[PDB]
Design a protein around this ligand. Structure first.
Ligand SMILES: Nc1ncnc2c1ncn2[C@@H]1O[C@H](COP(=O)(O)OP(=O)(O)OP(=O)(O)O)[C@@H](O)[C@H]1O
Ligand SMILES: [Mg+2]
Lengths: 240, 1077, 113, 13
């Protein structure tokens, strides 16, 4: 309870669990660290470890909003990247099987902010919040755990909306023929290098990407034993 | 053959007796023979004098029933020194080491002057034998005291081969002359000299008990007793001629023991009558002939394997009981006669002795099956059969050896009822010396006639029968018997015929103007139950009609009625063990559910008929691509669904059956996986669109599928048939397979093991799934009981929270092994027999070192050939080389459809696989300690729940047992299909999702079928968990820890046990009630 | 079949001329016939081996096999009037009454008095 | 009841 920060630098961020009848001061602890990366989409992010179950952005919007009020800090969270609670999105099967329509740890996520002014505000807030557990454990914030997204996940045996499905199939397809159509034109358009070499494309080829992969995937029988004078001498040698 | 031969040598040396004991015993009985010679002679005495002589002695004469009375015992008694000899296996030096122990047969020949020519009449010779033995025991006892050997020698009488007419003295050693460690017992057999009585007078057809009926049993006992050394001389000659005689003999002895065969008497009820002697004699009779042309079937140059094979082939094919019998000359080529005596007969013209008189007709038929069954394994070339033939005991449990077991409690059991005992009568005493002999046949004949074709083989066992009694008593004393009947109760064991075991009507003789003899006995036997009936074809026949029940088979009713009518109206017949197993199977909520037999698949066919109606509708529709085929792959299409399909019972997990819809090959399919899946959905939309318009009576809705990892675009169309059945449609495309292979090739090296797992699930659902349902359906018709046993096995797994991890297809493949590979047992013929065999297989299955591979073929093509068999074997060794401990893969189940062997058994956590075998081992151990009874079955089907670290209790808002189609109920689908979820159990999905998040830390299990294993209301389910040993203790804080943990130090964290419950609790919402940790 | 029903299938196909073909005839070179015959034999064997006799008959009624042959041989040479001309049943397994009843989708008598 | 201790080393085999 006196622990506020791990010496590797991960700040403990306790939470109060909900009150449920089957479970008659249990706490769940988050570990957080400032994340640094040259990548733009990963910039202005806060590395989070041991997230609550099914932690979407709306939850973090509640938590930061609760922190903002009690510390009168202006912090806005943009989006929570790399949240794969069940490991469903570890591999992009679409990317592997083709380049069209897809040009592309665990129990952790990256919490992106709107701007640097907000993330440092939250980090200053987070440290003070860590100090509360040692002194005044009562005021630790409560994890609501229930949101509109959570209800959708819970309702497993829910029929899909046919109206929604029809539109999704329509838009996804119509994009696709456009991408195939563009690809087939490029390959069979007399590709010529800067220095006058014409690429060879076979009929029915549809994508230049397929050509590259096909490349990556991919005299002794005509020799005579007895044709020259030295050969027959060699045969004569071994004969005797 | 070389592998088999070396196995034979390894077996022989293992069972070879240690030569040191032979000297040890040879030291003793050699000294024993001196004691016998010391015994003095004795004078003529009548029964009055010998009675007074033995009146005060501790010894009592073991007179054979009926005991000699003063009036009929005018003949006198005498004793003289015997012509001592040693006989048996020990004389031929053919014995092996037996942990239970062996017996050394010492023969004492009564001098011929003690007998008269007509002493084989009215038990004259036997009564002389009884006193000759009693006199020996008297003087032997005092001499034993004189030499001080009495301290460690125990003496007791007993019956030779459980023959009531031939009491014998048994000498055993308790813990220099002490031979207890040798594990031997000296038996004193008092035989007669050769040719004292004219053997022609002793023929089986003749009679020797005046009362005329023949006396095969009494004639044999006196005649065999007079022919002991002659057979020893016969066997000694054959041993010299062929060098491999003794090796063949022990092979037969080992084979006979495993099948529970012995030389002991069979008319009393116990299985036996072929022992080593009969096997040895028959082999000798074959070595000097055996063919109908009197040609030699065995040659003296044959090896041990060949000699054993010929006798097994001889027994299996040629009949010795009904049509044909074998004659030979011990002292002349053995010739097979076509005529039969209607009893097992191996006649010896030289001695006029039938060696198989101790054999009953019923037990003979069982061996011919066993001999024939092994002849098939012996001819098998693909699979080695040495262990099954010789190194597997099938007699340990009667339930595993026999399909059904009825124990009949006879009335007034300190003597049998006067009416019952009166049935014995004087006439059957002549035919059948003891009542146990008489009653065993009486049960067999009425039971055999009553059941008729419903059974293949029948065995009657007199439980609790003894064969040894103290020297102070004359006859065996049974606690229930009271010297009247040597048995507690009789048990009826049956091998039922699945094809006709459940026929509703017992057909009988056809109608005629004059009632034929066959018609008369049929009407007399069944009495009021007999009736004359007509059928659609127009035949008029005498038949009796029974009523099927879902709790017991028809055979239970027939035997109860048949035995009570003829045997005794007070008999109590009860087989509760089969009844409990029948009830454990869920009872469907269909009309007349209770009266349906467990072999009836009418419910499954009704689902198929509804599918056929939808099947026609789909083809006649017009689509951009024609429909190549519609292949049903649901559980109910292969008769494996735990609960039978019930109309509108949509709460059952197996309600929506999968169906693979395939279109014609086209080159226009999308080349990108997500586009391909959405292309498939577009076809389903049109199928739903046209189906909704043209056939409005069908209802339909769309549901997503996520079983294939990373393929999140799968959408399946659920069709609700008006008949009351649901079907799930998924589209298969030829481009689909190669797209997955493309992903594996393009995947980075470290991800390739992951992607192939995704492909492994896809083939298990689309490609391999079609093959499995095809083969299992066709095979199931030949194996009638396969569908109930596999359903009950799946029920057993669910109670113990294992089906959540064991995919269904693995469960069928394990449950079918007793059927496709019944050796050394028979094909299961009862639900009780089949289920226990599955547990026995799992208990003895060492999946780390032994692969399981099956020939999914109907009973004797598609049988695995030698090349294919070796190919799968090589696959297992490759896998175990990479996975020796078996962590990644546990069960290797392969067949023609799955030569790889990892298709249906991948992804099972090691604790679950060990738990499956661990439960099986306890179950077999439980049965061994406590016999199969009501309490044991309940313990089998009750789950412990104490091993699991924490246990979570869940209750559904509404009882789902009614909506699951289980009769302790909806009649239409909800108007709004969103209401379907209101009557579904989501805990199974919670466990699946919880497992993914806590794969690294926890293994959670739950009961998939809540309607069956959720109490009376089918509303209670339980989530049980296991903390891995690693995260159970404290660990250093790392980013890659991947677990919900609570700090104790700056770099020490422990599993946040309380928080995980809050996680588990809130999924349940109202569902979760109570927690146990 | 998978039911151990040995059967012999006969297939017949004809060559057709294209939409813009001007030559009177549409004969195929012997190489094309051998290639087409190889393709047809592969499909007939594949369908029969991976199916039951009851399933095989279910394939014959809609004539899906003919459409399968047409697509496979389309690149080799255009064809028309593709049919499964005949089916012979050479050998049959041991008779199974249980399977027969399942394909067709027992009865007590009436007392005569 | 039918209870067996959980084995993680496959020691039962
Ligand atoms: N069925 C039989 N017919 C005739 N004689 C028999 C029969 N069974 C046993 N005998 C006689 O009894 C003697 C001993 O029989 P037993 O069954 O003990 O022989 P075994 O095969 O040597 O026994 P074990 O299995 O104890 O080694 C045999 O040598 C033979 O003389
Ligand atoms: Mg013996």
């Amino acid at each position: 309870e006196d622990i506020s920060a791990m010496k590797n630098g991960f700040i403990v961020v306790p939470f109060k669990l909900p009150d449920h009848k089957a479970l008659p001061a249990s706490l769940h602890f988050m570990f957080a660290k400032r994340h640094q990366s040259s990548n733009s989409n990963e910039s202005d992010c806060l590395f989070l470890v041991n997230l609550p179950l099914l932690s979407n952005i709306e939850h973090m919007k509640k938590f930061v909003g609760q922190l903002c009020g009690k510390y009168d800090t202006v912090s806005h969270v943009e989006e929570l990247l790399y949240n794969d609670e069940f490991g469903l999105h570890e591999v992009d099967l679409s990317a592997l099987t083709s380049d069209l329509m897809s040009s592309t740890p665990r129990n952790t996520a990256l919490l992106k902010f709107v701007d640097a002014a907000s993330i440092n505000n939250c980090w200053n807030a987070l440290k003070k919040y860590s100090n509360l557990h040692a002194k005044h454990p009562n005021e630790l914030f409560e994890w609501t755990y229930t949101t509109p997204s959570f209800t959708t996940f819970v309702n497993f045996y829910k029929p899909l909306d046919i109206d929604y499905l029809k539109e999704d199939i329509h838009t996804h397809m119509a994009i696709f023929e456009q991408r195939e159509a563009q690809a087939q034109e490029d390959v069979q358009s007399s590709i010529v290098d800067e220095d006058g070499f014409t690429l060879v494309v076979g009929k029915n080829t549809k994508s230049l990407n397929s050509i590259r992969k096909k490349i990556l995937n991919k005299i002794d029988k005509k020799a005579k034993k007895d044709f020259y004078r030295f050969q027959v001498r060699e045969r004569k040698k071994q004969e005797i | 053959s070389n592998i088999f031969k070396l196995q034979i040598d390894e077996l022989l040396e293992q069972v070879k007796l240690k030569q040191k004991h032979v000297l040890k015993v040879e030291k003793f009985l050699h000294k024993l023979y001196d004691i016998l010679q010391e015994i003095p002679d004795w004078e003529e005495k009548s029964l009055a004098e010998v009675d007074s002589f033995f009146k005060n002695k501790i010894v009592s004469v073991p007179f054979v029933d009926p005991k000699p009375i003063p009036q009929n015992t005018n003949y006198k008694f005498n004793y003289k020194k015997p012509d001592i000899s040693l006989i048996g296996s020990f004389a031929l030096k053919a014995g092996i080491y037996q942990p239970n122990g062996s017996s050394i047969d010492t023969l004492l020949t009564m001098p011929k002057e003690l007998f008269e020519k007509k002493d084989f009449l009215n038990f004259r010779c036997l009564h002389k034998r009884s006193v000759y033995l009693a006199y020996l025991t008297h003087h032997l006892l005092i001499l034993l005291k004189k030499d001080k050997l009495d301290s460690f020698l125990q003496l007791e009488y007993s019956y030779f081969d459980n023959d009531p007419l031939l009491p014998i003295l048994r000498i055993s050693c308790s813990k220099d002359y002490n031979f207890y460690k040798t594990r031997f017992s000296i038996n004193l057999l008092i035989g007669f000299p050769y040719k004292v009585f004219e053997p022609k007078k002793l023929l089986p057809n003749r009679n020797c008990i005046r009362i005329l009926p023949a006396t095969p049993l009494y004639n044999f006992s006196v005649l065999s007793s007079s022919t002991h050394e002659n057979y020893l001389k016969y066997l000694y000659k054959t041993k010299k001629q062929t060098e491999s005689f003794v090796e063949a003999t022990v092979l037969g002895r080992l084979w006979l023991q495993q099948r529970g065969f012995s030389s002991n008497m069979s008319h009393s009820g116990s299985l036996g009558g072929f022992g080593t002697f009969e096997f040895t004699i028959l082999m000798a009779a074959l070595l000097n002939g055996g063919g109908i042309n009197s040609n030699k079937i065995l040659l003296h140059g044959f090896s041990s394997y060949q000699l054993f094979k010929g006798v097994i082939k001889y027994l299996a094919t040629m009949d010795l009981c009904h049509d044909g019998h074998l004659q030979f000359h011990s002292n002349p080529a053995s010739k097979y006669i076509d005529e039969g005596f209607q009893t097992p007969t191996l006649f010896d013209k030289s001695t006029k002795v039938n060696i198989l008189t101790k054999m009953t007709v019923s037990s003979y038929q069982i061996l011919k099956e066993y001999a024939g069954e092994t002849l098939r394994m012996l001819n098998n070339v693909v699979q080695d059969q040495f262990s099954n033939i010789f190194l597997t005991n099938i007699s340990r449990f009667d339930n595993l050896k026999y399909d059904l077991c009825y124990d009949v409690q006879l009335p007034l059991g300190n003597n049998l009822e006067t009416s019952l005992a009166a049935t014995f009568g004087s006439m059957e005493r002549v035919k059948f010396i003891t009542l146990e002999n008489f009653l065993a046949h009486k049960i067999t004949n009425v039971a055999r006639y009553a059941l008729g074709d419903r059974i293949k083989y029948i065995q009657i066992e007199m439980v609790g029968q003894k064969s040894d009694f103290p020297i102070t008593k004359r006859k065996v004393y049974s606690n229930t018997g009271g010297n009247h009947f040597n048995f507690d109760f009789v048990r009826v064991k049956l091998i039922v015929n699945p094809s006709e075991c459940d026929k509703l009507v017992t057909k009988g003789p056809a109608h005629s103007e004059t009632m034929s003899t066959e018609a008369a006995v049929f009407k007399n036997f069944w009495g009021i139950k007999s009736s004359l009936r007509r059928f659609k074809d127009g035949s008029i026949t005498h038949c009796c009609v029974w009523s099927t029940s879902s709790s017991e088979p028809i055979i239970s009713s027939i035997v109860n009625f048949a035995l009570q009518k003829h045997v005794s109206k007070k008999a109590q017949i009860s087989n509760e063990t089969i009844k409990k197993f029948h009830n454990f199977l869920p009872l469907p909520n269909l009309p007349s559910s209770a009266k349906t037999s467990v072999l009836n698949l009418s419910s499954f066919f009704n689902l198929k008929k509804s599918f056929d109606d939808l099947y026609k509708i789909i083809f006649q529709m017009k689509l951009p691509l024609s429909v190549k085929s519609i292949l049903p792959v649901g559980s109910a299409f292969r008769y494996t669904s735990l609960c039978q399909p019930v109309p509108f019972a949509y709460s059952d997990p197996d309600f929506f059956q999968d169906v693979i819809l395939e279109f014609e090959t086209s080159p226009k399919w999308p080349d990108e996986i997500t586009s391909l899946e959405k292309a498939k959905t577009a076809f389903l939309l049109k199928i739903q669109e046209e189906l909704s318009a043209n056939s409005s009576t069908y209802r339909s809705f769309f549901s997503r599928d996520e079983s294939i990892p990373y393929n999140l675009e799968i959408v399946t169309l659920n069709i609700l048939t008006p008949e009351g059945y649901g079907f799930k449609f998924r589209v298969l495309t030829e481009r689909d397979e190669i797209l997955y292979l493309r992903a594996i090739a393009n995947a980075r090296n470290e991800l390739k093991p992951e992607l192939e797992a995704t492909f492994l699930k896809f083939t298990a659902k689309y490609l391999a799934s079609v093959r499995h349902t095809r083969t299992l359906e066709n095979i199931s018709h030949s194996y009638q009981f396969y569908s109930p046993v596999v359903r009950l096995f799946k029920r057993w797994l669910d109670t113990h929270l294992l089906l959540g991890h064991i995919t269904d297809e693995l469960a069928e493949l394990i449950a079918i092994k007793p059927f496709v590979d019944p050796a050394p047992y028979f094909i299961p013929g009862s639900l009780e027999n089949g289920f226990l065999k599955v547990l026995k297989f799992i208990s003895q299955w060492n999946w780390k070192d032994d692969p399981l591979i099956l020939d999914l073929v109907k009973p004797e093509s598609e049988r695995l050939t030698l090349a294919q068999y070796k190919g799968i074997q090589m696959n297992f060794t490759n896998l175990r080389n990479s996975d020796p401990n078996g962590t990644h893969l546990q069960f290797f189940v392969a067949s023609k459809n799955d030569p790889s062997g990892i298709l249906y058994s991948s992804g099972i956590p090691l604790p679950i696989a060990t738990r499956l075998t661990a439960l099986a081992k306890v179950a077999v151990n439980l049965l061994q300690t406590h016999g199969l009874n009501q309490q044991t079955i309940n313990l089998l089907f009750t789950p412990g729940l104490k091993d699991y670290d924490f246990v979570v209790d869940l209750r559904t808002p509404i009882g789902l047992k009614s909506s699951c189609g289980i009769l302790s109920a909806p009649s239409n689908f909800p108007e709004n299909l969103n209401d379907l979820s209101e009557k579904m159990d989501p805990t199974y999905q919670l466990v699946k999702y919880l497992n993914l998040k806590y794969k690294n830390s926890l293994i959670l299990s739950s009961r998939k079928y809540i309607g069956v294993n959720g109490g009376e209301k089918g509303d209670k389910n339980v989530i049980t968990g296991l903390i891995k040993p690693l995260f159970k203790g404290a660990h250093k804080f790392r980013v890659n820890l991947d677990c919900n943990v609570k700090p104790v130090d700056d770099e020490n964290v422990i599993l946040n046990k309380e928080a995980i419950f809050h996680e588990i609790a809130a999924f349940g919402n109202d569902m979760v009630i109570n927690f146990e940790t | 079949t998978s039911d151990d029903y040995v059967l012999r299938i006969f297939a017949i196909a004809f060559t057709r001329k294209q939409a813009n073909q001007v030559k009177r005839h549409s004969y195929a070179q012997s190489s094309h016939i051998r290639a087409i015959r190889k393709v047809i034999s592969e499909i007939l064997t594949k369908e029969v081996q991976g199916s039951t006799l009851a399933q095989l008959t279910s394939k014959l009624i809609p004539e899906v096999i003919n459409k399968e042959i047409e697509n496979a041989t389309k690149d080799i040479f255009p064809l028309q009037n593709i049919h499964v001309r005949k089916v012979k049943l050479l050998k049959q397994p041991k008779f199974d009454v249980g399977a027969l009843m399942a394909l067709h989708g027992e009865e007590k008598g009436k007392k005569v008095t | 009841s039918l209870s067996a201790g959980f084995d993680w080393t496959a020691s039962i085999l």
